[PDB]
Design a binder for this molecule. Structure first.
Ligand SMILES: Nc1ncnc2c1ncn2[C@@H]1O[C@H](COP(=O)(O)OP(=O)(O)OP(=O)(O)O)[C@@H](O)[C@H]1O
Ligand SMILES: C/C1=C/C(=O)O[C@@H]2C[C@@H](CC[C@H](C)/C=C\C=C\CC1)O[C@@](O)([C@@H]1CSC(=O)N1)C2
Ligand SMILES: [Mg+2]
Lengths: 22, 357
């Protein structure tokens, strides 16, 4: 419940520029 | 580092969580010796003269498990060059995947590859996550299947999922049928690959199909040319947009199914009336078959015609949407809060494959 809430927050706030270039 | 493997009907996308793109993208095919003992992907095609080639995944569902094990083995040891027992592995599955299939994927990962942890996510949900959303409706169209998947607060709503067994390979087959009728020879699977390239390079979705037919009938403005491997140059005009029109008009290949715009609308109308505005305003397109130029504008037009007149409609079609499922999996498996959500091998040893649901 709390886990689901936090996970949603991290997904919605995620910046794809953080991802590593391949 | 966690791995992410998106097993498609046509292509396997695989790589490492936290990367911006899959390091490995290869054909989902396995070949075995026709006379008198396995190859996977491009090598299988190279040696097709001595092998029987099969796709282990049909319309997004795993159907040949022995071959699917060969695909995963190749993914781990040949493509990514990793020892699977060292890496948590996130796998993807199609919407409406039978419970038994999800259990069997779990059993093979833990018992055959000895992964330390795993998780299975629905492909369309990961595409939604890749757009930074946890609510919306995804049109995911790949090589073998097309789904409309409405998702609310992170969960796909299974009763409202729609499925069309029409996707990229059927569009290539249709283009191949049109070009054969015009007098070209495309028959073998190798030759069908030339047709697939024509389709990707030259096809588009018309905003108004009748109008576009009239244009092509009265002018050469829509014609494009393409040099075949034998040196012949083929010119196509209306074939460019008649091919993907089949997504809106499945009767073009003799299917009775409603088109992708109507399945989008019907999906939304299966959902709670109180979430429909969120779905209409968050239509995310995912998969290779959503790459055609024009497809987002056509969807906007068609859904506008079906929806209430004052409804806010938005089609989100990211440039990277050939890999949006995989990128969503890369994001999810990299997040700190997700780390407690992996099914561990210890939990599997206690409880068995049914833990995955
Ligand atoms: N630029 C393009 N235009 C039109 N079609 C495209 C384009 N690029 C790729 N495709 C098509 O997308 C399909 C592969 O897409 P994708 O990798 O999303 O499918 P998949 O995941 O293997 O299949 P599925 O999701 O159906 O199991 C192929 O049919 C290919 O011809
Ligand atoms: C660049 C590329 C794209 C792709 O998506 O290929 C996938 C996988 C491919 C495997 C069968 C072929 C012969 C063998 C080797 C292939 C590699 C081509 C890989 O079968 C597809 O072509 C099918 C058949 S025709 C079509 O529309 N889908 C989709
Ligand atoms: Mg797919």
């Amino acid at each position: 419940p709390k886990v689901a809430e936090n996970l949603k927050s991290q997904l919605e706030g995620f910046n794809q520029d953080k991802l590593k270039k391949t | 580092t966690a791995l992410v493997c998106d097993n498609g009907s046509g292509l396997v996308k695989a790589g490492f969580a936290g990367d911006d793109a899959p390091r490995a993208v290869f054909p989902s095919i396995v070949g075995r010796p026709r006379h008198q003992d396995s190859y996977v992907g491009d090598e299988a095609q190279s040696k097709r003269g001595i092998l029987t080639l099969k796709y282990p995944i049909e319309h997004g569902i795993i159907t040949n498990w022995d071959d699917m094990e060969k695909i995963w083995h190749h993914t781990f040891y040949n493509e990514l060059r990793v020892a699977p027992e060292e890496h948590p592995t996130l796998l993807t599955e199609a919407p409406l995947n039978p419970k038994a299939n999800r259990e069997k994927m779990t059993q093979i990962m833990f018992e055959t590859f000895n992964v330390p942890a795993m998780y299975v996510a629905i492909q369309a949900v990961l595409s939604l996550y890749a757009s930074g959303r946890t609510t919306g409706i995804v049109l995911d169209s790949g090589d073998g299947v097309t789904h409309n998947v409405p998702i609310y607060e992170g969960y796909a709503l299974p009763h409202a999922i729609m499925r069309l067994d029409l996707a990229g390979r059927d569009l290539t087959d249709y283009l191949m049928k049109i070009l054969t009728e015009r007098g070209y020879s495309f028959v073998t699977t190798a030759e069908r690959e030339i047709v697939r390239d024509i389709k990707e390079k030259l096809c588009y979705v018309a905003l108004d199909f009748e109008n576009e037919m009239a244009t092509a009938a009265s002018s050469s403005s829509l014609e494009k040319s393409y040099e075949l491997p034998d040196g012949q140059v083929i010119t196509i005009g209306n074939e460019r947009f008649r091919c993907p029109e089949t997504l809106f008009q499945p009767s073009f290949i003799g299917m009775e199914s409603a088109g992708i715009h109507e399945t989008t609308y019907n999906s939304i109308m299966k959902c709670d009336i109180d979430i429909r505005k969120d779905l209409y305003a968050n239509n995310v397109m995912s998969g290779g078959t959503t790459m055609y130029p024009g497809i987002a504008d056509r969807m906007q037009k068609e859904i506008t015609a079906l929806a209430p007149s004052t409804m806010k409609i938005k089609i989100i079609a990211p440039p990277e949407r050939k890999y949006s499922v995989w990128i969503g999996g890369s994001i999810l498996a990299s997040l700190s809060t997700f780390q407690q959500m992996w099914i561990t091998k210890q939990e599997y040893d206690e409880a068995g494959p049914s833990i995955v649901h």
